[model samples]
Target: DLTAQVTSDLLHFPEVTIEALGEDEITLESVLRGKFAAGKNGLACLACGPQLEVVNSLTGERLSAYRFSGVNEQPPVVLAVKEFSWHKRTGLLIGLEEADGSVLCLYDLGISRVVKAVVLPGRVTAIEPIINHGGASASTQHLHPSLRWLFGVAAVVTDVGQILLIDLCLDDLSCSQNEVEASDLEVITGIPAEVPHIRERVMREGRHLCFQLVSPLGVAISTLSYINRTNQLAVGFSDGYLALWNMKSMKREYYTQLEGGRVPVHAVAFQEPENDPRNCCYLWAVQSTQDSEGDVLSLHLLQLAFGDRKCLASGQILYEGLEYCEERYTLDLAGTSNTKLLGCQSIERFPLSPDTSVSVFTWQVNIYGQGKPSVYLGLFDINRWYHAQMPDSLRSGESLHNCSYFALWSLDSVVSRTSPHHILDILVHERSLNRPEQFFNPSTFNFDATCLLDSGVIHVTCA
Candidate 1:
C-alpha cells in the first residue's frame, strides 16, 4: 500500500526528483556509449601447482578466485613445481625450469591478455628485463622504463653459464591516438661462456679459479642493471666482484673485487633516488652465505666516475632470511623521481613479539611451498642517508651497518606503534568491499600487483 501510494502521488516526489531524474533518463541503449572505462584485469600465476593468490595493490582485493588443475602426467600425479622469475620490471617475460625442461611464459598485460607462451628443451635460469641508465632523452618524450619505449635490456643465464642478452626499444610509440609501435631492440654484444684459454692457463697451476659459475666456490655472482648514460649493463658474480660491462667494448669498462674472501656476490642493485631527480649514478651490492644458521643480507653503496669505479659507501644487514631466497628488488630504473627497492625473507628466528598473541603469522611460506605459511616483504626504509657517512674511515672500516636493517627490523621491532593485529596481515586483505586507495601509488609499490604486457614483459609508466 505504501509503495503504491508513493508511486501514485507525483506531487510527493522531492523537488529535485520532480525534474524527471534528469541523468537517469538515458536508457541502456543510450548508455552503451564507450569502452573508455575499461577496468584493470590482473593476471594470476601458478608456480609448480599451488594456486597463488593475486591481489589488487590499490584495492587489496584477491583477484585470483581459484586455480584449476590441468592434464595429468604419465609417470606421476605431480608436475615439478618450478621457480619462476618475472623480468625485473614486468611479469610479462617470465622464465621457468622443470625437471628436464625449461620454458618461457610471455604475458601481454597492456591489453589484459596472455598473448604468447614458449617452450624450451632445457630450463630457463634467468629472465632479464630492459633497463635505462640514460636519463630521459633530450629529444624523446617517453617516461623511464616503458617497454613501449625501453631504455634498457635483459640478460638470461643458463646451465652452461651462457648469458643471453635481450635489448628493449621504445621508439615511435606516439600515444596521440593510442598507437603503440615498440620495435624489437637488437643485441649489440655477447661474451663467450667458456673462460678464455689465457685465464685457464693461470688455473692449471692448481690455484683457485677466479670466476666460474660451475666451479666449487669459484666466486661467481649474477646480478642485473641497465645503463642509460651509455646503454650498458651492471652486474655482479659469485667471485665477490662487481663489474660494469659496455655494449661497445666486448669488455668491462671498470671491475673490482668487493670482498677479499669469496663472500660470493649473490645479488646486486642500483638505486637512483626518485626524490633526488638528479641523473646521478650509484651502485650497491649484497652477497650472502649460509650454513646450519640463518642468512645474512648485506648492502654496499658506491659512487661512480664515468668509466671508472669508486666505493663510496656500504652497509651490512644480517637478518634471519633464507639463503637461495635473498630476494630484494631494486626498482625505479629511470631515476630517483619514482623509485623503490625491496627484499623479503622468512626463517625460524624469533619474530617481534608483543603483549598480544592474536597478532602473527601462523606459518612460514617457503619458495617451493614446502613449509608453513610465512609473512612477506619484511621491507626496511634505508632510502636516504648522509653520503659522506658511507666512507669506511667514518666507521673505522667496520661493516658500516647503516640503519638499512631498520626497514625490515622495524616491523619485527618490539616497539609499539600500530596494534599487532594491524601488522600481522600486511599481506592479507580481510575486506569485502573495493580496496582502499593506499596501495595504488604508481611511483613505488608495496606489492606485486602488476599486469603482464603483450610485449612479453612488464610495461611500467612514470605516472
Candidate 2:
C-alpha cells in the first residue's frame, strides 16, 4: 500500500520506441519519488562485486544487500565502486575499501549492522559527510562552504597517500579509528601526497582536497571526482590534464586541452544540472587510455560556464563511451566489471520472477562512437556557475532520431533519480489478487497501493 507520485502531477514520457516498450522493458532518464527524508536504510554493492542493493527509501524496497566476500583474506581487485556513501548521521554505509589496502566499511542500515571493519590508511578515495554546520550535527567550519555542516568524517586515502579526517566529535573516536593501527586513524597527514605514479586519483569536497600530487600543478591525477552539481571539483590528469576546482573558492579551472596533451581520463561524470527547464546543463568525460591507435574509449562533451565562464574544449566531439539515448532517452551506461569477463554475459543467470523476485537483466549499450555532446557538469548559481551541455550525438545521429530509449528500472520509482523527471514512462502496478484496497486509487492515479498523505517535495538548498 504505497502511492505518492507528484513531480508536478507526473506527466511521464521522455521518449520510447524500441517499438513502444512496456513489457516492463522500462525506459527512463529521470525520476525521484517523494516524502523521502528517512535516511540510510540504503546503499548496496556486488551484484558481482561493486555490490549495491540497499533499498527502502520510504518503500522503494530491497533494504540491504552488500557482500564484500566477507572482507578479504585474498580475493583483491575492484578498482572503483564509485566510492559508495550513505551516512545521514548514523544510518551508516560508507565504502572505499580497495581489496589489499584502503579500508573502512561501516554498513549498518538501521541495525542490520556491519558496524565497522576498519583498516583504512590507503586507498579509501574520497568520502563526504562533513560540513553540517547550522543544521547542527556538531558545528563545523571548514571554509564554511555549506554542505550543511557537521565537520567530521572526510576521507581520501589513495595508494595510502593522504588527506584524511573523521572529527566525529573526536575525543578520540574509538581512540583514533583504524584497523592496522596507524596510531588508530584520523591521519590527515596533510591533505596532499602522491606516488602511484603521481596522484593516483583523490578527491573530497568540503575543505577542498583534490589529488594527483606532484603539483607545479600537473602530472598524473587520474580522473579524480567530486561535483555536487557544480559545487566543483574534477581531475582527469595523466599529463593530458583537465582540472577544475572552486568548491567555494579553491580555484583551478582547466578544461581546454583534449588535443593539447593527448588522452588518459579513466572516468569523470558531471551531468545533472537544470536538466531541462528546457535543457541546458551538461559536461561529460570517459576517455580511459587509448591513442596508440585503438581510440581509447573516448566520450567527451562540454560547455560548462558556471559563469566566470571558460570552456575551451575546442569544438567538443567523441560521444559514446557507451550508449546514451534518444527516441527520447536511453542513457544505460552498461555495468558488469567486477573483472569477470571469463565467459562474459551472465548477470548471475538472470531470471528471478519466482513470484516476483523480479530480476531480468541484460546490458551493453557501451555507447560505441559519435561526436558532439560533452560538458558533463556545471550549474551552481546565484549569478555565475551554470554552464554545461550534452547531446552531441546520442540520438542526434538520427535513425529517425527516436529519443533512443532510456531505462534503469530496478524497483522503478518512475526510473529513479528520486524523481526529477525529464522523461521515462511505464507504470504497471496491477496487484490486487485477493483484495488489498489500501492498494491505491488516488483519483485513479492508478495503483498497487495508496492512502493519500498528499505529498509533494523537491527542496534543494545549496549555497
Candidate 3:
C-alpha cells in the first residue's frame, strides 16, 4: 500500500483559544508560510473575524499579532491573505470584503501597518503572484535579470468574473516619500495610471501583460493556478468551465467545460514534467458534484504539449499549437466501506526531487456514513502516475477508475490525540455538547484551513 510509503508528523504547540465578537464569527480563513518578519521565515495565520498572528515555524515562537480594523468605524471582514516579496522587502496582502466593495491592503511587516490600500469594484475571490518572465527567447535576450523576475506583480480575481493585474509597487514604496492620499484609494475601473516604473519598462519591451476573463454572467472564478515556465494561467469557474490563458500573448489557449456541470472547481495546480520527450506540462484540478449518496470529488489531469519550431537563422525556438489530453479520477475514500466524501478544501503541488513531485489535497469525509464529517490530508504521486504506461483500450481519453497513487491520513485523528481538551472546549462552546469525538462537525466547527511549507511540513488550522 502507498500509505506505507508516506509518513506524517505534527507541529507541537501549546493550547490557545481565540475569541470573537457575538455577531462576528472567527474562522481560520487562510494560512501562509513566508518571510513574514525581518529575515525570518514563519507561518502567518489569518482569521476572518479579523485577527492575524505570525509565528516562527522552526522555533514555534510567536512573533507578532495584529487586529484588522475597518474604515470609518465599520467592522471589516478579511477574505483572503497572501505574502509577497519585492526588492528584499516582504509585505502581506490582505483582501477585505465590505458593504461597498472590496479593499486590497499592502501591510508592511517591518512597520506593522498598512502601507497602501486600493479599492476594487467587486469582492476579491483569490489573489496569486506573477513570478516568472514569460515567452523568453531571442527577443527577450537584452532584458535585465531583475526585469525578468516580475517582482511585486499579482493577479486578483473578483466575484464578478474580472481579473486585475496590479503592480504592488513595494520597491517604489521604499524610495518614494509621497504619502498616499484618500483620493488615491478610489475605485479602479480600468488600468490604474500609477503602474510601477519597472513594470512600465517591461511593458515597453513589447511584452503583453494583461489579465481579463470574459465568462457567462453570475459565474464567478473559483480558483486559479499559474505556470511560471510557460507563463500561463489556468482558471476554473463556478459552472465547471475551465480555461487556460496565455499571459505572454494575452490570448485564450484552451477552454472546456468539465463533465459535471454547475460544480465549482475547488483548486487547480500546474506540474512540469521532468525529462519528457514532448515537453508536456500537466494541469491538476479538483472539483466536486453531488449525487444520490453524497458529494463526489473528481481529480483531473490534463497533459498539454506545445509545438515548437526553430528558426534557421537565429536558432531560437518559437512555441505554438496547443495539443491536450485529459484524464479523470474519482476519490473512493481509499476503499473505506461506508464513508462518503463531503467536499475537497484545497490542493497544492510540492516538488520532492528533480524527477518526482507530489500533490497534496485536503478533503472532508462523512466517516459514520451520515452525520458529522472528518477532515483528511491526501498525497498523490504525480510523477508515478505520469510515467505509468496506459493500456490501448483506454487511449481514447477515458478516465481511469483505479486510484492507486493516493494515500490519505485523517486530520481529526491527529488533532484528537494532540489536544483533546481543546477540542472539548470548542465543542462545548459551539454545540453545547462535550463529545470531542465529533469535533469536526461541519455545521458547528470550521477546520479546512491548510498550508504546505517549503520544508514539506503541512500546517492545518482547526477552529
Candidate 4:
C-alpha cells in the first residue's frame, strides 16, 4: 500500500534514481598497469592480468580489446612494460617482458591483435620507443610527435648485458607454400622488406644487432636511448656508468663514470636534429642519492661530436676549463625508492619546439606519513635551457645549464603536484579522425581533468 501510494500523488518531494549505462560502458576486471597513446587521442591500455584495451583518449571509448594469446604463443603476460610506439609505415611496436624472455610485439591499426612478437634473448630491464627525427619543413604546418610517423629502431636493454636494436617490416611472405618461418626472418635495414624481390631473395631480413660491451666488472644495462640521426645508442648502467655506441660506425665512441662510479644511472636521454648528422649532440644522464643534504638527483649533460673524432676517441676533454662537474635538478622527497626521471618526447613543433619533456616518477611508501603507496609525479621542461644562449664565460660553444627556464606545478617543496593518472596515456590518441589542438599547451596541465583537442578543451568523460 505504501509503495503504491508513493507512486505519483504521494511523491511530492522529488524522484531520485540512478541509471547505469546499458552495454556501452566498459568495466575493468584487473588492475591497469600500462597505458600508452598510439596516435592522437588513440590509447593502448594493458591490464595486469591479460587483456589489452585500445581506446579513444578523449572520449574514453574502447575501440578494440585483445587477449595476450590472440597472436602470440603464450598468454599476453607482460612485466616491465613500456610505451607503445607506432609509425605510419612500420605499424606499432610494443616491448613486453614474458617469464621466459622479453618480446617486442607489433600491432597494426584496428587489428586488436599482436601481429608479431620479436622476442629478445634475456630478461628485459628497460625498453625505449624510437622517435623519428625527420627534419622540419618551414612551409608545412606544425607537426606533433604523436601525429608524425617515426622510422627508427626500438632499444631493448636486457639482463644479458647487451642492447638489441630493432627495426620493423611487414611480414607477408610464403616460401614454397610452407609459410615464412620465424627462424628464417633475419634482421635487415637500409631497405624496406615490403619489396617483393627483397622479401623473396633474402633468407633473413629486417636488421637487428647486439653489440656486447666487455668490462672488468658487472655491466647491467638499466636504461637506453637510440639516436637515429647518426645511428647511435646511449646507455645507462647499474654501476654508475654511461656510454655511447655508434651503431652505424660500429664503435664504442665514449664512456665515463658518474658520481665516482657509485651513483647508479637512473635515466639517459639525448637530442639531435635530422638535418645535422655530423655535428655534436648532447646526452643527458641522471644519477641520484639520499643523505643529510636531502635527496639529490643530479642531471649531467655531456657533449659528443663527430668532428673532434681523435679528441673524443682519445678521451680528451677538448673544451679545456669547461666545468663537467654537472648541473643538478633536485626534488625534496629524494630518499624514496625507484625515484627516476622519464624523458617524454615534446609535442611542440620545429622552430618553436623544445627538445624533450621530462617527467620524474618515484614510488612513495607513505603519503607524507599516511599509509598507502603514492607516486610522486612532476613535469620539467629542459628545452628552454638547451636553446638558451651560452653564458659569457661559457662561450665558444660551451653548453651551459640554466634552471630559470625550468617549470614546476604549484609549489610543494618537491614541487610535484596532483594530475590525472591518465595524462601519460593520452599523450597520443585518436589515430583516424582526430588531431591535437594547434594552440594546446601540454605544459599547462593541472589538477583538473580534460583532454586537449584541436577543436578546443572538452571534458574527459565519454559522452
Candidate 5:
C-alpha cells in the first residue's frame, strides 16, 4: 500500500520582505531542480524578483543566491529559471522580460555567476533545452549530418511568435563570460527564408502540393515543447495555433489550430511513446477559455510519427501529419459537484519510475456556491492508452476519436488545505536506486512532492 504524508514548512533562505517594483508582496515566481556538475543531489533553485536563490531541496537550506542588475541599465526580474546543460557543465538559464526587450542569462553553477547573456527583441515566453540525443535508427541515418550537434542546443519562443535556437557551444570551454547585445546575438528564426533541399525536392516531384510556409504574425507564443530525438519543436500560440517546427531542416512541418481558434494554448509537453521512442512521440496541449457560464478546460493529445517508413515511402520527408487520438476532459473538484474549472495553469511530465511516468495537470477551480478558487492537481496515466489499439480511421489522420481509458486523479484531498492558497510551482523528486531489486520493492523507493504557494507557504509531501 502507498501512503502520503504532507507537511508545510517555511523556507530557510533569507526572507524577502521588500516588495517588487510593481508587485504588492514579494512572491516566489518559480522553482526548479538544480543541476550541478557533481549531480542534482538534493538541490533546488528559486526565482523571486531579481534574485535567484539556490537552496537545499529537502530542508530548504539556502546555499547561495545571485542577483541580476545593470542588464540594460535596469534590474531585470527573473520570470523563469530552467535547468540548462552544455557539454558536461550543468547550470541554470534565466529568462527575464524587460520593458524594452527580453534577456536570457546563462548562469554557471560551478562559478555561481552569469556566464553569458543575450538580449532579444520580444518578451521571452518559453525556453526548452534540447537534451534528447535520439538513438541511431535506420530512418535518422539519412537525415542531416549536422543534427548531431543538437545536444547543447535550446529552443526559445517569444511573444512575437519568433522561434530562436540558441547554440550553447558546450564544446568551447574558453568562450564563457560574454555579454551579447541584441545585434550581436545570431538569431535562428523558426521559418527560414531559404527553402531546404528536402522541401525543394518534394515540390519538384509534384508531391505535397498543398505545402505552404507562412510566418506567424501578431500572435503571441504561449508555450513550447521540444523533442531532441525527432528534432521537432511544438509551439502553441495565443491564437490557438499549434505548429511543429523541424529544427533539422529549419522549416515548419505541421500546422493546425486547436479548439476552433477560440481558446489559447496555455501549456504544451512532448513525450516519446514507450513503443516507438525513435520515430513517434506524443504532444499534450492544455487550453482554457472563460465564457459566460464559466471557464472551459480542454486537453489535446496528438500522436505524431516522424520519419516513419510508411509515410516517408510516399515522399513525405519528415512528418506524416497523422494524429492518432485526441482526448478532452472537463476537470472538476473531486467531492464538490458543479465545480467550475477556472483554468489550467500548466501540464508537465512527472516520472514515477524508470519506465513509467504521468502527465501532471495543475488547474484552479471554484466549488459550487463558493467564492474562493482552490488549486487542484491531476495525474494522467499514459500506460492505459499505450496498450490500446488505434482505430483504422485515426491512422489516416482523417477522423478523431475519444480515448477514455487513461486515468486522471484529483489530488485536492491529498493535500487538503483549508485556507486560500495558490500554487506557484511544483517539483517532484525520487530517491535514486542503485540496484535493480529496488524497483520491485516498493518500500525501498520514496517519492517527494514539493509545492510552492503564492502565500509564501511551501508544502513537502513524501510517499
Candidate 6:
C-alpha cells in the first residue's frame, strides 16, 4: 500500500521550486493568510506586516489595499493578522499585542468595517481562531454552517502562560468604566441623571469573553495552536514544557517535556489526524538547545493521549539543529512581535497516506549569509522511523529557497506538469517500478492517476 511505503522509511523531498522574494526582511509573525472571493473561485490573500497589499493567489493580481484606522486608546499596528472564513463571509482578525494586552480587531472585508474587537487579558503571544466543527449533535444545533451560528473560537496565549478561551457572547465583557460620558442632562428629573450612549447595547451584546489558563509557573508562553475537532489547546513554553488543555472542560489534560525542560521551544503544533482523529494523536515540537558546535535544533514527535495522567515523556529527537548548522540558536525577545528565530521555526504535518503524514519544516539556512529561507519535507512513519536511529543520509531534503510566502494550497491549483514529473521520478525511482513503457508513452503516460499508481503490480497495467 502507498501508506505502508510512505511510513516504511523517511520522507523523500520538499519537491518544490524556489521562488525568490524582494530584499524586504520578512518574518513569520508578519506573514498572514486570508481568503476572498474573486468571481466563482475563492483566492487566498497573503498580507505581510504594514503597508498591506492583498493579492490574488492564482492570477497574481493586486486586489485591494487595506487602510486600518484605529479609534481605541492604542492606534492599531497590525503585528499579526489571520483570516476567519465562515458561512460566506471573509474577515481579518488583526492582532495588536503591544497596546494594553493585545486587542483582536475583527474586520469584515465584505462590509469594510470592524465587526467586533476583543481585548485579551495580557499581551498575546499567539492567537489562532480555529473552526470548531464539533460533534454532529452540537453542529446540528449551534455549530451549523449559517451566519447566525458563527461557529468558531480563538485560542489566545499570553506571556504569563495563561491560555485564554475566547468566544462570542451577549454579555458586556468590557470594563464598566469603558462607557461613554453623558451628552445631555435629563430635563424631567430634578437631579441631573447621566444619559447613556446609544452604542452601548451593541457593544455589550457583541462583547467576547477571554478566559484565563491556570498553570503552575504561569511562565511566558512561546507558541500555541488548537485542535478544532477535538477542542484541544496545545501551548508551549520558553522553558521547554508543552501542555495540552481541553477547551470544553477548561482543564489541562496532559503535560510533556522537551530537552530536559530547559531549552527554548520555538514551535509546538498539533499533527492533525486525517481519517479518525480519535484513533491517532500526535504533537510536534521544535526546541533550540545550546551545544559545543552551535545552536542544536531538536525536533520532537510526541504520541499523546486525551485522558493521560500527566504525560512526562520527552519524545524522540528526530532531527538535530547542529546537523543543519545554524551557528547560534536564538529565541524571540519577550514582548517582541514578529521576531521569530532564524532557523527551523515551525513544522506543519500534511496527509500523504492513510497511516503516514508528511512534515514540512519551515527553516532559514543562512550559514553563508545568502538569507535563503526554505522548507524541508519529511515523513512521520511510526513503525519505521519512530525510535529508529536517524542516519546521516536522512539529514535534509530538497530545499525550497527564497520562499517568502508559503501557505496550504489545493493540489489541482498548486501542482504543475513539472511537479508531476518530479513526483513520478521520485516514486518510480524509489520503488524501482518497471514502468519505463508508461514513462515514455504519450497516450498512456499523463500527469493524471494512471501514471502514478497508488499500489504495487499492474494496478496500472489496464484500468
lDDT for each residue of candidate 6 in 1-463, tens digit (9 for 90 to 100): 0111121211221111011111113432333322232123223333333334444333334444554444344333455556666456676665655444566655566765555566665677667775532223423232212212222556666678766555433122243211111011111211111212312333355444333445664587777766543456677787888776654455676675664347756665444343433244455677754212224556666655343222112221111111111111121221101222222212223322123333333222224343322212222323223222322113244111211111111122112212322111111111211114222221121111111111111111210
Model 4 per-residue lDDT tens digits across residues 1-463:
0000001111110111001111112332333444444344345443444445444444444555544542335443444444454434323455555545666665554455555455566667777654433233321112222112212345667665666554333333232110011222243323232433443354354332222334333477776765543345677776678776654343556667864345657665554322333455455566654212224556555555555322233232222121222323333334434333322332322321123333323222223454333323333334443443322123344221213333333211211212222212223111111114322222333322223221112332111
**lDDT on C-alpha atoms for all candidate structures:** 0.29, 0.31, 0.48, 0.40, 0.51, 0.39
Task: Write model 1 residue lDDT over 1-463, tens digit each, in one string.
Answer: 0000011111121322212222223311111000000112323222222122233333323333122122122111011211222333232444444344443333333333222233332334445544332234442222122221222334455443444443222221221111011111222233333323422343243221111112123232355444433344565665556666554333455566664334444444343332222233345565544211213334444545342222212221111111111112222111101111223221111121111011111111223432222222322222323222233222333221232222111221111211121111122111211113323211121222111111111111111
- Please report the candidate that would top TM-score against the real structure: 5
Model 4 spans > 4 angstroms off: 1-32, 38-41, 70-76, 80-90, 128-154, 166-218, 260-264, 271-281, 288-298, 305-348, 352-368, 371-403, 411-463
Task: Quote each prediction's TM-score.
Answer: 0.42, 0.24, 0.66, 0.55, 0.66, 0.53
- At residue 7, candidate 1 shows an lDDT of 10
Task: Report the Cα lDDT for residue 291, model 6.
Answer: 17
Per-residue error at 216 for model 2, in Å? Answer: 5.7
lDDT value, residue 107 of candidate 3: 62
lDDT of 5 by residue, 137-242 (tens): 4434433344433324556678787776654444434445532332134333333334345433533442211111247667778777765434567788877778
TM-score of structure candidate 6: 0.53
Q: Name the TM-score of candidate 5.
A: 0.66
lDDT of 3 by residue, 320-397 (tens): 456664544443333232332322322223331134444555555555554444555555555445544422123344
How many backbone clashes are present in model 1?
38
In model 1, how large is the Cα lDDT of residue 144?
A: 22
Worst ten in a row by lDDT for model 2: 339-348
The TM-score between candidate 3 and the true structure equals 0.66
Query: For this target, which candidate reaches the highest lDDT against the unseen true structure?
Result: 5
Residue 169's lDDT within candidate 3 is 45
Position 40, candidate 4: lDDT: 45
Error of 6 at 342 (Å): 8.3
- Could you tell which candidate, 5 or 6, scores higher by lDDT? 5
Question: Over all chains combined, what TM-score does candidate 1 have?
Answer: 0.42
Each candidate's number of clashing pairs is: 38, 63, 0, 15, 0, 1
- At residue 161, give the lDDT of candidate 1: 41
